[PDB]
From Swiss-Prot:
Tissue expr: In brain, highly expressed in striatum, thalamus, hippocampus and granule cells of the cerebellum.
Species of provenance: Mus musculus
Protein name: SH3 and multiple ankyrin repeat domains protein 3
Location of the protein in the cell: Cytoplasm; Synapse; Postsynaptic density; Cell projection, Dendritic spine
Record note on disruption phenotype: Animals deficient for isoforms 1-7 exhibit self-injourious repetitive grooming and deficits in social interaction. They show defects at striatal synapses and cortico-striatal circuits with an increase in striatal volume, dendritic length, and surface area and a decrease of spine density, length and thickness of PSD. They seem to have an altered molecular composition of postsynaptic machinery in the striatum. In contrast, animals deficient for isoforms 1 and 2 exhibit a normal initiation of social interaction with a perturbed recognition of social novelty.
Length: 93
């Protein structure tokens, strides 16, 4: 079965920190539910500590649904908040 897990990730970084993660008509499937998934999730990093994971998709960023949005615009939405980032995500096993 597919077990979809809905999560909200609040990523709070100190000035000397990165968050520690990397990303990359669209057509869905539980396997790939959204456009922008996680490729790396540096363990013990800020991305890790808020409970994110390798393979986690991106559904909402800082309030904006990114289910059908490309890399450029989503990064610009990751950078807009500076030392803080709230992301709606979903794990599918």
């Amino acid at each position: 079965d597919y077990v979809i897990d809905d999560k909200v990730a609040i990523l709070q970084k100190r000035d000397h920190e990165g968050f520690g993660f990397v990303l990359r008509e669209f057509t869905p499937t539980p396997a790939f539910p959204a456009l922008q998934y996680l490729e790396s999730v540096d363990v013990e990093g800020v991305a890790w500590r808020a409970g994110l994971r390798t393979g986690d998709f991106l559904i909402e960023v800082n309030g904006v649904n990114v289910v059908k949005v490309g890399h450029k615009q989503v990064v610009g939405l990751i950078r807009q908040g500076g030392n803080r980032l709230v992301m709606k995500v979903v794990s599918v096993t």
